[PDB]
Design an enzyme around this catalytic site. Structure first.
Site, PDB file in Angstrom:
ATOM      1  CE  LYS A 149      -4.256  -1.829   1.970  1.00 26.62           C
ATOM      2  NZ  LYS A 149      -3.941  -3.217   1.559  1.00 26.62           N
TER       3      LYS A 149
HETATM    4  C1  LIG Z   1      -9.987  -1.222   3.345  1.00 26.24           C
HETATM    5  C2  LIG Z   1      -8.729  -1.123   4.225  1.00 26.24           C
HETATM    6  C3  LIG Z   1      -7.742  -2.068   4.173  1.00 26.24           C
HETATM    7  C4  LIG Z   1      -7.750  -3.327   3.260  1.00 26.24           C
HETATM    8  C5  LIG Z   1      -7.545  -4.545   4.200  1.00 26.24           C
HETATM    9  C6  LIG Z   1      -8.593  -5.367   4.635  1.00 26.24           C
HETATM   10  C7  LIG Z   1     -10.075  -5.126   4.195  1.00 26.24           C
HETATM   11  C8  LIG Z   1      -8.299  -6.443   5.504  1.00 26.24           C
HETATM   12  O1  LIG Z   1      -9.302  -7.298   5.965  1.00 26.24           O
HETATM   13  C9  LIG Z   1      -6.948  -6.694   5.931  1.00 26.24           C
HETATM   14  C10 LIG Z   1      -6.676  -7.793   6.805  1.00 26.24           C
HETATM   15  C11 LIG Z   1      -5.363  -8.043   7.225  1.00 26.24           C
HETATM   16  C12 LIG Z   1      -4.321  -7.220   6.792  1.00 26.24           C
HETATM   17  C13 LIG Z   1      -4.588  -6.147   5.937  1.00 26.24           C
HETATM   18  C14 LIG Z   1      -5.936  -5.895   5.508  1.00 26.24           C
HETATM   19  C15 LIG Z   1      -6.217  -4.803   4.636  1.00 26.24           C
HETATM   20  O2  LIG Z   1      -5.161  -3.986   4.212  1.00 26.24           O
HETATM   21  C16 LIG Z   1      -8.560   0.090   5.200  1.00 26.24           C
HETATM   22  C17 LIG Z   1      -9.755   0.195   6.227  1.00 26.24           C
HETATM   23  C18 LIG Z   1      -9.641   1.512   7.067  1.00 26.24           C
HETATM   24  C19 LIG Z   1     -10.425   1.503   8.370  1.00 26.24           C
HETATM   25  C20 LIG Z   1     -11.825   0.938   8.129  1.00 26.24           C
HETATM   26  C21 LIG Z   1     -10.519   2.948   8.907  1.00 26.24           C
HETATM   27  C22 LIG Z   1     -10.183   3.054  10.426  1.00 26.24           C
HETATM   28  C23 LIG Z   1      -8.663   3.178  10.618  1.00 26.24           C
HETATM   29  C24 LIG Z   1      -8.146   3.116  12.083  1.00 26.24           C
HETATM   30  C25 LIG Z   1      -8.522   1.779  12.713  1.00 26.24           C
HETATM   31  C26 LIG Z   1      -8.691   4.301  12.889  1.00 26.24           C
HETATM   32  C27 LIG Z   1      -7.714   4.795  14.000  1.00 26.24           C
HETATM   33  C28 LIG Z   1      -7.979   6.271  14.409  1.00 26.24           C
HETATM   34  C29 LIG Z   1      -7.275   7.295  13.506  1.00 26.24           C
HETATM   35  C30 LIG Z   1      -7.961   8.690  13.584  1.00 26.24           C
HETATM   36  C31 LIG Z   1      -5.791   7.405  13.794  1.00 26.24           C
END
Ligand SMILES: C/C(=C\Cc1c(C)c(O)c2ccccc2c1O)CCC[C@H](C)CCC[C@H](C)CCCC(C)C
Ligand SMILES: CCCCCCCCCCCCCCCCCC(=O)O[C@H](COC(=O)CCCCCCCCCCCCCCC)COP(=O)(O)OCC[N+](C)(C)C
Ligand SMILES: CCCCCCCCCCCCCCCCCC(=O)O[C@H](COC(=O)CCCCCCCCCCCCCCC)COP(=O)(O)OCC[N+](C)(C)C
Ligand SMILES: *[C@@H]1O[C@H](CO)[C@@H](O[C@@H]2O[C@H](CO)[C@@H](O)[C@H](O)[C@H]2NC(C)=O)[C@H](O)[C@H]1NC(C)=O
Ligand SMILES: *[C@@H]1O[C@H](CO)[C@@H](O[C@@H]2O[C@H](CO)[C@@H](O)[C@H](O)[C@H]2NC(C)=O)[C@H](O)[C@H]1NC(C)=O
Ligand SMILES: CC(=O)N[C@@H]1[C@@H](O)[C@H](O)[C@@H](CO)O[C@H]1O
Lengths: 693, 31
Positions: A188
């Site tokens: 990524k």
């Molecule tokens: C769609 C995303 C990643 C793709 C993905 C997926 C679906 C997986 O199943 C993975 C499993 C194992 C390893 C890698 C995987 C992977 O690459 C980002 C999703 C972003 C998230 C939903 C947003 C929230 C982000 C963090 C937790 C928030 C923390 C607070 C901040 C303000 C610092």
């Protein structure tokens, strides 16, 4: 005691020689966490087989007699008949149950592993990154002594009740999970993910609502989704290992996985990863959790005494390591090294390389490329008559991944070559012309539209000569494109094209798309109207008004690729919408008391709402009534309590499972006893496809 | 399966505009 040996769990002296590395990867360890992961993984696969693998919809995918084009990894692989496929899936279910309950573990793992990889290799259009992970975890677990704790095989055999396990089982599992996280993170680092183009519209989901209280939408769509995801991948790789930073890591990873489960429809990947996260905790957390229970409950929970010695571990008194210990250590090292190498092995298999790298499924490049297709044409030339014809875009196929990948396109061409001669077409030559864009770039061809794919050249270990390069030099234009795309009205629509030198695009604009214009952005093109055989040469920034209902060609004459755009408005839909709005306004005026004059007879069905005892409604009336019904249905759907939605979800899943079970029973009975008469089969199939209610 | 010349050279046709995350299970069922 040493600081450097307590944060990693092994002193450096344990790596001095081979005989001491084998004594470190076979150290005794508690089997408690491995059994819990085994149970959860088996249960999740049991749930997953009737939903994602496709046991419910297996009677329409592998139906006998139907002629479809398959995309196997090897051309030798061929599906068996449907009944034997159902038997194979039955063996998968039995193996998953055996893994769950730990009954005949080493046979159940084989019975689940072999069918799963057969199904996985039988079709290249169903390769996700989680199916590969499930297969790898089964392959690992086939060799791990996970039946020592909380297993029926322990009850049967007294030498496997609460017995030690070698340390390399946990090592292999933790290495697999760390590789997943870290390779996803490093993959990524592409310029699209760090800039905000992959998953640009995901910030609008309601789960990101609190973030918007402190940041704008764009920053929430860049800092939180993209950079947060990258940082979380790397940190979830590293933090969970160390004791000091495990609570924070578990919290972030759990929140990440729950949000992924709600946002996407990946399946059981999120729950499997949640189950895998506790493997980094101490090897005896279930035992200490069991200890803190009332004495009454312990009569059903597993034991709490210390585990007994096992003959699968090396004990320090000394003991010379035997044969299975060395093979275990070698398996650990070789498997982890191969897992590291495989994602970056695309310089050997160049045949599968394309605009992206390699076949999708084993690179951990999750959610990094988004593709939009504009058009697909298939043209054929009879080898005898010489006539030219055009086929449907996706005939004789059950997936739409054959467009992006060349190896699948060759198989599609060969399948069409074999199937066409029963429709009087002899010795066809098949050409393809596909328009695809990745991460909001200019639409451009992906394959050469002049090469006969049927009799082309393709080998897995050489580069394909008929795949067009990606025009990444036009990457910076995207910032301008949105500015053009955000200045349009609610009716106008825009399409962008970038074309290679020496090639031309022939387009037949429909009769509805009146007021269609072409404007040049970069390069030099000539636009030909065939109705009068007149061609005009265009320079940068020159606009032309094209016909509506005639062919027109655009030739790219510049030495370099040329970029242009189409701007069109659907005149027929606009006129229909104005007329419908006028009719609705008149109906509202009648309802509120205005327009006291008697309604026209054509308007009477609208107020009545039912065509009974009168002339059939006009097309305008039919469209208005259909829109009213659709709006009412949408309003009803929006205003539904939560419990109804939950009940409908449960009923749908129950229907899926019931259909799977009944069809499998019918297939097995067909295999063993025989096939009854056609009427009985029809009645049974009708019984299978019955809503539970 | 055969289609006319006009319908096969109609680039500006209403398509189901959407993205493509290849790591997503297909719906399978329908109404
Ligand atoms: C769609 C995303 C990643 C793709 C993905 C997926 C679906 C997986 O199943 C993975 C499993 C194992 C390893 C890698 C995987 C992977 O690459 C980002 C999703 C972003 C998230 C939903 C947003 C929230 C982000 C963090 C937790 C928030 C923390 C607070 C901040 C303000 C610092
Ligand atoms: C002649 C040949 C000479 C040898 C050549 C080959 C040398 C290879 C050396 C590398 C392989 C060594 C394997 C050792 C096994 C090992 O240590 O396993 C484990 C370690 O677990 C693993 O397998 C870790 C997997 C990788 C996870 C990511 C770690 C990131 C580390 C970053 C740098 C710091 C010991 O842990 P334990 O069960 O005792 O748990 C206690 C640890 N804490 C406190 C952190 C929870
Ligand atoms: C120690 C613990 C350590 C931590 C462990 C954490 C992980 C544990 C995981 C265990 C498994 C939990 C359940 C998983 C359920 C699951 O995956 O749900 C589902 C799949 O699971 C199911 O649906 C299971 C249903 C089983 C059948 C249930 C039938 C119950 C019938 C009840 C009686 C009704 C009677 C009515 C008449 C009176 C996923 O659905 P989907 O992918 O379509 O998701 C929909 C939503 N989107 C599209 C947004 C994604
Ligand atoms: C309009 O201009 C086009 C573009 O040059 C002409 O087409 C080329 O047509 C000639 C004559 O058949 C071919 O030899 C060339 O190979 C074509 N060029 C390319 C790049 O394919 C077209 O003939 C012109 N039409 C009229 C009526 O003058
Ligand atoms: C232009 O507007 C028309 C409005 O009629 C759109 O038509 C629907 O298009 C589908 C697909 O071709 C037809 O099956 C329907 O019958 C059309 N609806 C009608 C006639 O009410 C059309 O999709 C729009 N776009 C184009 C490119 O024509
Ligand atoms: C005279 C002749 O060649 N007839 C065949 C006919 O069998 C078939 O109906 C048609 C379309 O498939 O293809 C052709």
């Amino acid at each position: 005691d040493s600081r450097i040996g307590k944060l990693l769990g092994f002193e450096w002296t344990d790596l001095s020689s081979w005989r001491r590395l084998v004594t470190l990867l076979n150290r005794p360890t508690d089997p408690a966490s491995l059994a819990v992961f085994r149970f959860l993984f088996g249960f999740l696969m049991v749930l997953d087989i009737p939903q994602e693998r496709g046991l419910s919809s297996l009677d329409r995918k592998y139906l006998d007699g139907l002629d479809v084009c398959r995309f196997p990894l090897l051309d030798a692989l061929r599906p068996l008949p449907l009944d034997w496929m159902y038997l194979v899936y039955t063996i998968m279910f039995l193996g998953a149950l055996g893994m769950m309950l730990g009954l005949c573990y080493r046979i159940s793992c084989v019975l689940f592993l072999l069918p799963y990889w057969y199904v996985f290799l039988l079709d290249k259009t169903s390769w996700n990154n989680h199916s590969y992970l499930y297969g790898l975890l089964a392959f690992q677990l086939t060799f791990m002594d996970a039946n020592h704790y909380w297993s029926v095989d322990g009850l049967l055999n007294a030498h496997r009740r609460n017995a030690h396990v070698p340390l390399w089982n946990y090592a292999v599992l933790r290495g697999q999970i760390f590789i997943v996280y870290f390779i996803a993170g490093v993959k990524k680092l592409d310029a699209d993910w760090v800039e905000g183009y992959s998953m640009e519209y995901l910030s609008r989901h309601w789960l990101f609502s609190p973030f918007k209280l402190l940041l704008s939408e764009e920053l929430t769509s860049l800092l939180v989704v993209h950079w947060g995801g990258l940082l979380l991948d790397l940190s979830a790789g590293f933090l969970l290992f160390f004791d000091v930073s495990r609570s924070i890591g578990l919290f972030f990873v759990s929140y990440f996985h729950c949000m992924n489960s709600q946002l996407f429809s990946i399946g059981m990947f999120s729950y499997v990863m949640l189950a895998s996260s506790p493997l980094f905790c101490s090897p005896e957390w279930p035992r200490k959790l069991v200890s803190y229970c009332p004495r009454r409950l312990q009569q059903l929970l597993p034991l709490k005494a210390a585990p007994q010695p096992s003959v699968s571990c090396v004990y320090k008194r000394g003991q010379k390591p035997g044969l299975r210990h060395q093979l275990g250590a070698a398996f650990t090292l070789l498997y982890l090294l191969e897992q590291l190498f495989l994602p970056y092995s695309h310089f050997l298999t160049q045949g599968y390389n394309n605009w992206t790298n390699g076949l999708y499924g084993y690179s951990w490049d999750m959610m990094v490329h988004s593709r939009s297709h504009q058009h697909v044409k298939i043209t054929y030339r009879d080898g005898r008559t010489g006539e030219l014809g055009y086929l449907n875009p996706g005939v004789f196929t059950q997936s739409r991944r054959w467009k992006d990948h060349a190896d699948m396109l060759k198989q599609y061409a060969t399948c069409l070559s074999r199937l066409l001669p029963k429709y009087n077409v002899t010795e066809p030559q098949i050409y393809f012309d596909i328009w695809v864009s990745i991460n909001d770039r200019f639409q451009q061809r992906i394959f050469d539209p002049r090469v006969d794919i049927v009799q082309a050249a393709w080998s897995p270990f050489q580069r394909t000569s008929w795949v067009q390069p990606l025009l990444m030099d036009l990457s910076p234009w995207r910032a301008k494109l949105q500015e053009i795309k955000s200045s349009l009205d609610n009716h106008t629509e825009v399409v962008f094209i970038a074309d290679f030198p020496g090639l031309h695009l022939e387009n037949f604009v429909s009769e509805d798309l009146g007021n269609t214009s072409i404007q040049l952005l970069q390069g030099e093109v000539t636009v030909e109207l065939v109705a009068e055989q007149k061609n005009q040469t265009l320079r940068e920034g020159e606009k032309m008004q094209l016909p509506a209902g005639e062919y027109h060609k655009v030739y790219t004459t510049s030495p370099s690729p040329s970029c242009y755009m189409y701007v069109y408005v659907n005149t027929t839909e606009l006129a229909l919408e104005q007329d419908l709005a006028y009719l609705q306004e008149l109906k509202e005026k009648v309802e509120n008391g205005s327009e006291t004059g008697p309604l026209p007879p054509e308007l009477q069905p609208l107020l009545e709402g039912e065509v009974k005892g009168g002339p059939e409604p006009t097309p305008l009336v039919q469209t208005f009534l259909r829109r009213q019904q659709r709006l009412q249905e949408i309003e009803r759907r929006r205003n539904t309590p939560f419990h109804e939605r939950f009940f409908r979800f449960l009923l749908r899943k129950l229907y899926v499972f019931r259909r799977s079970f009944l069809m499998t029973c019918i297939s097995l009975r067909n295999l063993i006893l025989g096939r009854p008469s056609l009427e009985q089969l029809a009645q049974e199939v009708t019984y299978a496809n019955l809503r539970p209610f | 399966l055969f289609i006319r010349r006009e319908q096969a050279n109609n680039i500006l046709a209403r398509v189901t505009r959407a993205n493509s995350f290849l790591e997503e299970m297909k719906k399978g069922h329908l109404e």
